[PDB]
Amino acid sequence: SMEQVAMELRLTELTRLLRSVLDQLQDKDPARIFAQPVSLKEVPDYLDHIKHPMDFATMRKRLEAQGYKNLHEFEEDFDLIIDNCMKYNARDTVFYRAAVRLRDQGGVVLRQARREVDSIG
């Protein structure tokens, strides 16, 4: 049906936007602290601490399978990256302080993206 095709054109354009948003967010992490999942081999207790791990690569996998239906969903995953990091790591560590910086810098990008999604439907 043509109704189905139209929803699919909208999902694809959402996805195109979200890829730009993801690359913008990932540029605020030049150190690449958040690029890949936490290694269970290198932090073996991690899953006792954090119930929903998240990282940029896992977001990108989901993005390329058009698995984000709206921006709320993508925002939820981004926030997990930040929030997991601020719980596991103490306040005086390089990791916590990188999350805080990514939150503040990403918060700008996501403030405009919310306007572009409303504005472009």
UniProtKB/Swiss-Prot annotation:
Residue intervals of the Bromo domain: 9-113
Function: Scaffold subunit of various histone acetyltransferase (HAT) complexes, such as the MOZ/MORF and HBO1 complexes, that acts as a regulator of hematopoiesis. Plays a key role in HBO1 complex by directing KAT7/HBO1 specificity towards histone H3 'Lys-14' acetylation (H3K14ac), thereby promoting erythroid differentiation.
Protein name (Swiss-Prot/TrEMBL): Bromodomain-containing protein 1
Positions in coiled-coil regions: none
Tissues in which the protein is found: Highly expressed in testis.
Cross-link (Glycyl lysine isopeptide (Lys-Gly) (interchain with G-Cter in SUMO2)): 41
Assembly: Component of some HBO1 complex composed of KAT7/HBO1, MEAF6, ING4 and BRD1/BRPF2. Component of the MOZ/MORF complex composed at least of ING5, KAT6A, KAT6B, MEAF6 and one of BRPF1, BRD1/BRPF2 and BRPF3. Interacts (via PHD-type zinc finger domain) with unmodified histone H3. Interacts (via PWWP domain) with dimethylated and trimethylated 'Lys-79' on histone H3.
Compartments (UniProt record): Nucleus; Chromosome
Lineage: Eukaryota, Metazoa, Chordata, Craniata, Vertebrata
